[PDB]
Amino acid sequence: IDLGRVIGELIDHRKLIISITSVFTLFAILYALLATPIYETDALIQIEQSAPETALLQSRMILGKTIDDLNLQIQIEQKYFPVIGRGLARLMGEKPGNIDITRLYLPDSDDISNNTPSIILTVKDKENYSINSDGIQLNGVVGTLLNEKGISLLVNEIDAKPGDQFVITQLPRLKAISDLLKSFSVADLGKDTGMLTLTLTGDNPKRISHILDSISQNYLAQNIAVRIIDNAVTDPNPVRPKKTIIIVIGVVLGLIVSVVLVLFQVFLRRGIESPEQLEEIGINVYASIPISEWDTLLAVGNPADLAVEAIRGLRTSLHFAMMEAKNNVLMISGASPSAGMTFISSNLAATIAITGKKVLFIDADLRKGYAHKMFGHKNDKGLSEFLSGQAAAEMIIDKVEGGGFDYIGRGQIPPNPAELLMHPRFEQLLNWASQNYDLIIIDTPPILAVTDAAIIGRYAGTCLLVARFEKNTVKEIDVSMKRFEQSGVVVKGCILNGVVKKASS
Amino acid sequence: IDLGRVIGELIDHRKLIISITSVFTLFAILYALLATPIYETDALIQIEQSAPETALLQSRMILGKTIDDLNLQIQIEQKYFPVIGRGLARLMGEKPGNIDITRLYLPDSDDISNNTPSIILTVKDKENYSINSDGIQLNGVVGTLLNEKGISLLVNEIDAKPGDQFVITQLPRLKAISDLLKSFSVADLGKDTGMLTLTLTGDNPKRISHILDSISQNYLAQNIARQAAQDAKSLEFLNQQLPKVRAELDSAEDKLNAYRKLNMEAKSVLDQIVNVDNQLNELTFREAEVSQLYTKEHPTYKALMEKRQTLQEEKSKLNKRVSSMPSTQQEVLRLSRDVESGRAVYLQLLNRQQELNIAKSSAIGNVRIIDNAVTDPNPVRPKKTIIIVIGVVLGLIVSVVLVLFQVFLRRGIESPEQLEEIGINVYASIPISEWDTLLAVGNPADLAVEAIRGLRTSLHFAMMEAKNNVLMISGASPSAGMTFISSNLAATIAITGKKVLFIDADLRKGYAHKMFGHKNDKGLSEFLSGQAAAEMIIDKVEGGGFDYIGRGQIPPNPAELLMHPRFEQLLNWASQNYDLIIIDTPPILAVTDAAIIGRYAGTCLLVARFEKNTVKEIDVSMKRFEQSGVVVKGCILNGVVKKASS
Ligand SMILES: Nc1ncnc2c1ncn2[C@@H]1O[C@H](COP(=O)(O)OP(=O)(O)O)[C@@H](O)[C@H]1O
Ligand SMILES: Nc1ncnc2c1ncn2[C@@H]1O[C@H](COP(=O)(O)OP(=O)(O)O)[C@@H](O)[C@H]1O
Ligand SMILES: [Mg+2]
Ligand SMILES: [Mg+2]
Description:
The structure is cut from a larger assembly and holds two copies of chain A. Helices cover 38% and strands 24% of the residues of chain A.
């Protein structure tokens, strides 16, 4: 391979790459701007060793004493319904509220799994509030204690707007100790000094400072029954999330996934890409019709389109190729349906009729042909009604309105098309028409699907295949060529279709 | 190779890969949701070194003391019949029951292998229960002790629904110590500090906490005993008492020797009394030590006194039972009682002396318990997420390797390119027909009939300039499609207004007359043998349009019949009255009928099954036709299916 190919592929798939990278970067931005900030506080302790003290600091005794002092077993959570309500509330400048609780005791349901009882407190005003545990609504007031239904609760100094809601959970002492220990760290930083650095990470900038101060005071008072060089202070800059690295990771991940997806798509495409592939095998590509961005003939509605120019080029190629042929019958066929046989054949008939030569257009697609729909029709007495013998050769031929060439529609769909096409009346029709017209163009069904094309091809002076740009493959075209060879029909060449401009070319 | 091939193979075998991965993931889910949870408890000990203490913690002395304290030698298992009953019971929210047992003693069968006696206790209500050891059913009640058939049992506070069953095993002390030590671990975590982390893993969240607490308390009390031992008179008391007990033991031994120079019930009650005496002596020592180091109102002391009362009750019952026995055995029973009691007390006092020396020679001034044992509510095993990930990855791996094995073990044809490489013109490729009647008649618009019409158009040009109008369809292996292709082709050529004759020259297993509607008399055999004319053999297909000649009766010498010149006369006569003659033949790799017939055939075509036959078989068939003087025009693939790997 070469760099030109990969650059062309990247340029071609720029839209997909940009879209994927943009969506990944947007997700990264949302996460980095909605994640709850996590502040870090630290303290410095002088030890008058330091390994046993490091192990003893994180013992459940000291942390439990601190939790009992600060009532860390009463979890209060401001309630936002979604997973992003807190982030947007912080972004909108909304001030988070807080409630000071000094006494809580829930009935302690203590089922198999949920060992943590919880209630919901809704703020009604600055003074009173509502409590619901399992739908049981009660009214309480700040100040006076509440002792009802096995629930004891004391509220002091509630600071929030009315209508706010808070989840109040009485989690077990061990769970609170584990939570505190999970975010609390100790280091020596000298490996021999009396200096110990204590670190605590949490989302409340003042609560973590108070907690670490309490931990240090408890440790010092326990030992005195060691000096605090630096009382705990909180860094105002959050340590998580790190927005810049998150955005960089998002952008890089988007680029990587876009690149690998583009590589997968490139290595999984098999369709034709240029007439060079067909010319390698030994097939003369007679044209390359581009896609027409424009139920009427393109060669009539928009005679100056690019596709009609390509078809005029094909007409000039044919005027020399179709010399010294045994007769003046051209058969346009294909490999797979919806390739362009009818489009190419009809437009070519129009472009050859506009030059003053009489043209006949036969729609021998007795299975799904719709030429009469595209030309304006008297659908009676098609090709079928002639082949079966219930019509003459004169009532089948009609005139296109904006064309200039005659046509013979299929007519009624027969039950035995391929068995009809073998009738000698078909050859009689072609022989009669060849003496009254300058050109006869026969449209046929695919050859990979049915065998009508190979039956008709015996009486065709020239035969041309039509290959779709991206859909068909070189293998399909080669198989079609060989299947025409076996049946005794010599294919002149191919005609690419549906071409679009690709930067990788 | 290329990535396209492997992607195509994966897409083709998506069903197998998905099935295998799904079943493996289901098994992983079942294991991760049915495995018994294992909780972990831990404790933190301060050492006032730490390597000798690490070795001493896991010594049999401390663990044995803990087991004797907590009666860990009485294994109680809730009974579920299957290997998954416990998991589903836990999943269904069923509350597991428990029984508190303070005294158990089984008859101790003690055979060659099963040194662990066991019984089954079935819950009948909140109060009474049933006991079965080897089918012997007994009824007991919580509270009142049971002492029957050499079985002593005490039950307190049974909490389960009636109808539950429990296996009660009295496993040996050493086995219990090994089980406890297997799941118990100690670490230093500082390599120099006095901090030791003790870990214990078990399935009962409270029992493991109690066990680890007991271990820590025993270790601390053993270490601290030094301070309350140097001045303790227990040292001299033991130093004086031991010679007396040894002298008594020697006297009992001499008396037993003198009396010596085997009743099952007698020996059983002897062992019962020996056990009771051992428990009483050890309980007396434990009560003394607890009264020294604890208070009477402490629940442990009350447990000791109730156990002592129960032991006294059992001793009274055993004494009554002895009083019910003849004195001739009672004398030997008393002698054995004295000897065994002396031995047990001697060993117990030796242990007391050794433990006292252990305490006195203790160097650590005071070991402290920083953190009493607590249990993590989140189980440490099984780890569900990693189990599921491993299951999914294993399923993917086994599916991939199986697909690779199948891909590298296939040899059949896959595309007409393989046959065209060797130099064989593949004239068609008939797809499989998802639809005992001709396909070209029942469903004339099927894909296979379209492919056969393509073959007909190919033949109409191939069969030109041939020496006559006879076509011979043959094959390599049976059940390839010779009759299917030949009959359908005859139908599709007859529907175009050309007269067709169909000869079924498969004189061994031909069934054309079955598929066409038959007058089975006067087949091909009856003509070749000479017992029929050329006119009674030809019949008309009903929904066809072509004549046919069935095989008829199976002859004993088919290949020797086909060499008769009357066969050539028949073909020459038929060639002047029909537009086409199609002859079906048996395979050529199996028999030689095809090569005999092929001399008079203008055109010959082989039929190759898609996946079954191989390029080698087709080449061998071509060469075997060449040797016999028959020129094969080409091949016809059959049974084609759409494969993504193409
Ligand atoms: N170069 C082209 N530009 C725009 N539309 C095309 C082109 N070629 C074919 N088509 C359109 O795509 C459809 C399939 O082509 P058509 O020839 O009618 O079917 P078939 O190949 O099976 O006979 C048609 O509706 C046709 O108008
Ligand atoms: N393309 C096909 N689609 C569906 N069934 C087929 C096809 N080809 C053969 N068979 C069926 O499989 C069986 C074997 O084919 P057959 O020609 O009758 O045996 P043999 O090849 O030994 O003479 C037959 O029952 C036939 O109907
Ligand atoms: Mg068409
Ligand atoms: Mg057969």
